Amino acid sequence: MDYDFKVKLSSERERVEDLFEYEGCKVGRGTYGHVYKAKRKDGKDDKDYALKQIEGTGISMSACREIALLRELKHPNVISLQKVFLSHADRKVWLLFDYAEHDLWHIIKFHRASKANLPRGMVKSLLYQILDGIHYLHANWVLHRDLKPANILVMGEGPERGRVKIADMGFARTFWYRAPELLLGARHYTKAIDIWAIGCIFAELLTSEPIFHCRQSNPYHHDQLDRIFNVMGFPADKDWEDIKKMPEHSTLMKDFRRNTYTNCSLIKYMEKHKVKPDSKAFHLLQKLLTMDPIKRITSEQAMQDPYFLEDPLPTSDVFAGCQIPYPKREFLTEE
Amino acid sequence: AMAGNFWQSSHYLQWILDKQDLLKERQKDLKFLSEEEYWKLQIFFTNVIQALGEHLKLRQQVIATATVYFKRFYARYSLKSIDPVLMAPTCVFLASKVEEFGVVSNTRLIAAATSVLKTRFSYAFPKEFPYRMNHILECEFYLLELMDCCLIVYHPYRPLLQYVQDMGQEDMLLPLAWRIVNDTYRTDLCLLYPPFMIALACLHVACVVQQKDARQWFAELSVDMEKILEIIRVILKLYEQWKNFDERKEMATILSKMPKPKPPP
Ligand SMILES: CO[C@@H]1C[C@H](c2ccnc(N3CC[C@@H](F)C3)n2)CN(C(=O)c2c[nH]c(C#N)c2)C1
Numbered sequence: 001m002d003y004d005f006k007v008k009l010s011s012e013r014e015r016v017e018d019l020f021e022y023e024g025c026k027v028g029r030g031t032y033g034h035v036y037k038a039k040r041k042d043g044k045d046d047k048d049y050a051l052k053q054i055e056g057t058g059i060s061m062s063a064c065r066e067i068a069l070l071r072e073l074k075h076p077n078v079i080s081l082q083k084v085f086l087s088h089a090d091r092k093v094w095l096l097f098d099y100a101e102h103d104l105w106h107i108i109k110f111h112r113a114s115k116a117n118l119p120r121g122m123v124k125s126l127l128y129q130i131l132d133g134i135h136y137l138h139a140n141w142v143l144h145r146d147l148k149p150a151n152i153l154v155m156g157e158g159p160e161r162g163r164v165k166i167a168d169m170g171f172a173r174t175f176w177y178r179a180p181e182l183l184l185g186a187r188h189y190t191k192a193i194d195i196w197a198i199g200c201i202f203a204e205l206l207t208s209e210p211i212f213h214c215r216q217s218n219p220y221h222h223d224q225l226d227r228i229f230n231v232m233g234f235p236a237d238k239d240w241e242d243i244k245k246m247p248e249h250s251t252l253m254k255d256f257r258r259n260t261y262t263n264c265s266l267i268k269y270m271e272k273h274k275v276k277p278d279s280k281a282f283h284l285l286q287k288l289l290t291m292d293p294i295k296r297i298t299s300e301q302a303m304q305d306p307y308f309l310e311d312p313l314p315t316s317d318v319f320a321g322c323q324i325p326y327p328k329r330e331f332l333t334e335e
Numbered sequence: 336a337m338a339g340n341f342w343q344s345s346h347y348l349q350w351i352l353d354k355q356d357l358l359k360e361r362q363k364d365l366k367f368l369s370e371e372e373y374w375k376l377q378i379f380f381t382n383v384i385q386a387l388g389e390h391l392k393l394r395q396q397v398i399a400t401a402t403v404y405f406k407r408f409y410a411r412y413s414l415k416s417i418d419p420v421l422m423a424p425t426c427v428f429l430a431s432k433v434e435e436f437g438v439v440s441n442t443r444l445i446a447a448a449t450s451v452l453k454t455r456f457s458y459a460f461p462k463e464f465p466y467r468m469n470h471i472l473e474c475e476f477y478l479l480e481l482m483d484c485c486l487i488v489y490h491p492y493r494p495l496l497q498y499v500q501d502m503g504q505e506d507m508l509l510p511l512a513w514r515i516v517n518d519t520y521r522t523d524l525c526l527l528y529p530p531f532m533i534a535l536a537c538l539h540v541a542c543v544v545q546q547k548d549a550r551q552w553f554a555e556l557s558v559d560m561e562k563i564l565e566i567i568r569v570i571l572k573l574y575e576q577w578k579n580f581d582e583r584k585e586m587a588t589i590l591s592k593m594p595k596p597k598p599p600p
């Protein structure tokens with residue numbers, strides 16, 4: 001490497017530790033890496049930022065997909081990548097975004113903890129915005145592959161108040177959000193797999209409970225499938241014709257009997273959680289939660305559902321001007 | 336992944352360059368090499384990347400993406416900034432990750448570069464490949480930042496398949512037009528024109544070669560045929576250069592004239 005080229009680059013190189021104040025401000029730690037609530041040290045902005053140190057050193061498949069995709073994707077419901085910092089000494093990659101004070105994991109946890117001890121169209125607006133961001137990804141042949149409440153961020157106070165931001169494109173290639181074809185050995189991720197995850201989220205927004213909640217290498221997972229059949233019922237041959245084609249179909253036949261789930265249906269489940277089966281919300285949930293992926297509704301068809309034309313209409317701000325009762329995120333003392 | 340998004344992509348918005356800006360940045364290397372020798376070096380390194388990709392059993396799309404990363408790097412930076420012998424396998428290694436082929440192991444990437452240069456390019460390289468994985472990893476960081484993290488690259492292959500399918504001439508024209516698209520990587524075309532325009536120029540040259548009348552199909556296109564003719568002239572010029580160039584006889588001399596990285600004090 002040319003020395004003059006190297007010192008010039010090193011002199012011009014923006015370092016994350018010099019630009020942002022984030023030590024002690026970790027709000028997330030997972031397979032994605034570490035997410036911090038950061039502030040600019042130069043103080044020309046008073047905005048909060050989200051700084052992510054990607055997991056591992058160098059550019060993994062995960063980091064590569066997240067950078068490659070977020071560098072192109074531009075949609076109001078997809079988290080926007082501002083900057084990439086490449087720390088040469090430790091080979092760490094940092095990604096900068098706007099800070100979303102909220103996410104669906106915390107919002108749902110807040111409602112769940114309340115039932116133990118929402119504005120009218122908040123759930124509808126969250127679903128419409130998730131559908132809008134996923135439809136943009138799918139129109140661009142991008143599968144999320146890991147949709148869950150935790151990576152569905154929602155902006156707090158500011159110019160984008162209550163706007164959903166879909167996060168985490170780094171899934172390069174619990175199971176409560178995994179479509180049943182994945183649990184039966186499906187060899188590829190599809191748009192339908194994302195749609196099933198959106199259906200799980202929608203049901204959880206309506207009831208505050210993970211619809212396919214289940215106890216903690218092989219793609220086949222008995223208890224998770226059992227929970228799905230306890231909620232949905234056991235698929236008949238006519239409901240999912242190509243189920244015979246799944247690699248784990250004979251394992252499903254050996255471990256399960258249809259009659260066990262004879263009084264099981266999405267209608268009965270949602271009835272227990274006080275959601276009316278005759279509502280447009282229920283009919284849309286059922287179209288998203290279809291066992292056979294080829295029979296699952298598309299994100300664009302979901303956006304056209306009459307549920308979104310029924311009062312109340314979805315709003316740009318999911319909180320619809322209402323005081324946000326949700327607390328701010330807590331800082332993890334990561335050691 | 337990102338198919339259909341060309342007009343809103345970083346490839347179009349940042350990496351479709353102005354020919355004069357490109358020629359201006361090249362002047363620093365043209366102090367050591369003639370324009371002809373600089374072109375021959377780009378032909379040479381496109382062939383090195385192709386050979387590295389073949390050795391690693393990579394799909395043509397991975398090889399093409401790696402070739403574009405290499406061209407984008409030397410479109411903005413001098414041949415002396417980083418050794419192109421280290422840059423070429425580094426481009427292949429990163430493209431294989433972007434194209435979701437996988438992480439080529441340290442031993443596999445180093446053995447493939449050592450083996451390809453030794454068995455296929457010893458006319459240009461008397462010594463064995465001297466770089467190790469730490470160098471490739473260092474280079475990867477530099478290549479990523481110096482491309483502004485733009486990893487999604489569009490190639491003429493997909494629009495070409497759509498055009499020959501529309502023509503109903505796949506069996507006759509696709510093999511040749513596809514090979515001509517491979518040849519366009521020996522030139523600066525991917526840095527100057529949208530891929531669908533390079534695909535049309537290749538398809539046009541294939542029709543001329545195979546004496547297939549396609550004037551009406553080409554006239555029914557809502558495209559700037561002047562830009563298509565500019566690309567066709569670049570392809571015809573490459574064939575004349577290819578004919579007059581003997582890469583095996585000339586590359587050891589051209590590589591010696593090339594500016595080399597300055598060591599630290
Ligand atoms: C309270 O625990 C979490 C806070 C996390 C958070 C808070 C604010 N901003 C972000 N991001 C901005 C853009 C991305 F870098 C993520 N992430 C989100 N959560 C996660 O699980 C999570 C799953 N995948 C990713 C990623 N990547 C995060 C819950």
Ligand SMILES: [Cl-]
Pocket residue numbers: 239289290291292
């Ligand atoms: Cl069903």
